[PDB]
Amino acid sequence: MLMGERIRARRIQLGLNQAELAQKVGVDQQAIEQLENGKAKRPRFLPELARALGVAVDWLLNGA
């Protein structure tokens, strides 16, 4: 998969919603939506979201 599908997948694996994931990283829901559709490549928070998700930036980028 790409990033957008990874992020959607792991979120739904976590049973969280976009706004809830977003909030617990610190980001807006909208940043998660654009990431899902592939519009944000590397937004600022990528290591923060990765850390909050429990995965690497390399996992986010590529999908280990």
Swiss-Prot record:
Q: Which residues form a coiled coil?
A: none
Q: Oligomeric state and partners?
A: Homodimer, when bound to an operator.
Summarizing the function annotation, the protein's role is: Binds to two sets of three contiguous operator sites in the phage genome.
Q: GO terms for molecular function, please? A: DNA binding
Q: Which residues bind DNA?
A: 18-37
Q: What high-level taxonomic lineage is stated for the organism?
A: Viruses, Duplodnaviria, Heunggongvirae, Uroviricota, Caudoviricetes
| Disulphide connectivity of cysteines | none
Keywords (A to Z) from UniProt? DNA-binding, Repressor, Transcription, Transcription regulation
Q: Where is the HTH cro/C1-type domain?
A: 11-60
Give the protein name, as stated in the record: Repressor protein CI
Included range, full protein: 11 to 63 of 95
